[PDB]
Amino acid sequence: MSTYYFVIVGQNDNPIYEKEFSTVNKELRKEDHRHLTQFIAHAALDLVDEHKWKTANMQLKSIDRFNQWFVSAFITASQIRFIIVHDNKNDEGIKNFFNEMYDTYIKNSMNAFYRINTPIKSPMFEKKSEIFGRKYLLS
Amino acid sequence: SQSIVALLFSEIVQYSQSRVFTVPELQTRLHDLGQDVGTRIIDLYFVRERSSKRETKLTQMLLFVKTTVWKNLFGKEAEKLEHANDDERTYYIIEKEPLVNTFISVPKDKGSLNCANFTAGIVEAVLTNCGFPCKVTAHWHKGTTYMVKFEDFVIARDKQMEEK
Amino acid sequence: DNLRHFVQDYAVRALIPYIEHLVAILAEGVTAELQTRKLGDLYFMFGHYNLAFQSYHQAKRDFNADSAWQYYAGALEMAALSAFMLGTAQRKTYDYMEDAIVCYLTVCKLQQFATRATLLSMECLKTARLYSEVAKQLIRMTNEESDLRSALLLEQAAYCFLVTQPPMHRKYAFHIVLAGNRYSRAGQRKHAYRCYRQAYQVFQKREW
């Protein structure tokens, strides 16, 4: 199968949120995935910042490929760093998946109570993300 | 209405003028409100009205974000743009229309600065969220005018990518 | 004393014929796949930078089919060293060197000569400007290596990628945390603590 990992990064490099869909097993190793990739999102970011200074493309499909960890970047106008990291490729899912992530993010970013670079606990957003994952990633 | 927004904004200014003691911190509070506006409008208009595609380069983003923000705020782009050689950090964005005068303005004795700073606050929000930390001053020179002090790392960064 | 230096003088006067016999061997060499190899092993101490680049050149036409590119790696080690020593720092010889190191590890199992090449290629690419290049091949040497060795190459990759530009400013720290326990298992205890301390420093810098 494919592994599933989403991350949300504030402008101030704050990891706002992270979402998972992989078949549940060895939860300690899934947390290892989390920090592995959250700290991979570190050089990925130190890289993708100049990459975004190069191209203002819709979405930076590939930033690094660790030969088992894959870096896909959809950076926002507010520079919100977004990365999907997976052991397997699925480009068509990920492109418009980051699209729909961005969309529901706009929806839940409008609310005045949110302030820049802040974790968002809205389980409505959780189920919106889950529906997207079942649409564009999971089967 | 026009006048409902003018009224709600008069209550803005008055709430500040209440729980704020002196003018410059009142302008600071206006600037905070402006940051609040920008913080979400910029992400909105990345897609719908900005060709859905990101733009990074300085002057293009300056002018185009100027225009798109003004179209979806008042539908009136800023009348001119000056970027000053004598200080490459010093750019001026100037709009003859003050957002303030929806209600025509304040006493002309106590507060030299006005909503002009609150609009400057929205400006600062969008710039710094695009990737352009900057400080903005509102001056009553040639009507409502502004001046932007970009970020040093940013100023070096684009000064370097002046070429490809 | 003066008498000790008189013996010193006589010793260096007896070294004149020795280096002149080496000069005669160099002359015999400059006048095959093993002839080119020996020639290289020669000006390896005569300072012939042009002939060092010609050694790798002839070794590419001598080991074209021959799977003994370990002597081609040796000739390229001299070529890259002599290039940066003179100041030419040829990026051509730099890339060829990797073609006789990491790319030669895919051909034959001469990892000894491959690691020799990568070692000096790191220093010559560090004096150049491609410090991320050394780091990327040190990561391509980390997966193999061993335990203490793998951690050492990860620590080299860490600083190398960070030196050129911000790229790897906290992932370098994240991977020296894994290299830290790698050193602890076999990694030098001094290296373990100092790379852990390095990681913690940039962790506080980037707390988020």
How would you describe this protein?
This is part of a larger assembly, with chains A (about 140 residues), B (about 160 residues) and C (about 210 residues). Chain A is an alpha+beta fold and about 140 residues long. Chain A is about 45% helix and about 15% strand. Chain A has one domain. Chain A has a four-stranded antiparallel sheet, with helices on one face. In chain A, helix 2 (about 90-110) runs antiparallel to helix 3. Chain B has one domain (about 1-165). Chain B is built from five helices and four strands. Chain B has helices at about 1-20, 25-45, 60-75, 115-130, 150-160; strands at about 80-85, 90-95, 135-140, 145-150. The longest helix of chain B has 25 residues, at about 25-45. Chain C is an all-alpha fold and about 210 residues long. Chain C is built from eleven helices and no strands. At the A-B interface, helix 2 of A face helix 2 of B. Chain B: Belongs to the TRAPP small subunits family. BET3 subfamily. Chain B: One of its GO terms (biological process) is vesicle-mediated transport. Chain B: This is Trafficking protein particle complex subunit 5. Chain B: Keywords: Endoplasmic reticulum, ER-Golgi transport, Golgi apparatus, Transport.
Nutshell version of this structure?
With 139 residues, chain A is an alpha+beta fold.
Number of domains of chain B: 1
Strand content of chain B: 5-15%
Percentage beta strand of chain A: 15-25%
Tell me about the largest β-sheet of chain A. 4 strands, antiparallel
Tell me how many strands of chain A there are: 4
Helices and strands of chain A: which structural class? alpha+beta
Query: Over all CA atoms, what is the radius of gyration of chain A?
Result: 14 Å
Alpha-carbon distance between the termini of chain B? Answer: 48 Å
Distance between the termini of chain A: 10 Å
Give the helices and strands, then pairings.
This is part of a larger assembly, with chains A (139 residues), B (164 residues) and C (208 residues).
Chain A: E1 5-9, E2 15-20, H1 27-54, E3 70-73, E4 81-86, H2 91-109, H3 123-137
Antiparallel strand pairs in A: 1-2, 1-4, 3-4
Chain B: H1 2-19, H2 23-47, H3 58-73, E1 80-83, E2 90-94, H4 116-130, E3 135-140, E4 144-149, H5 152-160
Antiparallel strand pairs in B: 1-2, 2-4, 3-4
Helix pairs in contact in B: 2-4
Chain C: H1 2-30, H2 33-43, H3 49-60, H4 69-86, H5 91-99, H6 102-107, H7 111-127, H8 131-142, H9 148-164, H10 171-185, H11 189-205
PDB class: exocytosis
Keywords: Rab1, GEFs, Golgi, TRAPP complexes, exocytosis
Entry title: TRAPPCore plus C8 (355-596) and C11 (1-718) from MiniTRAPPIII
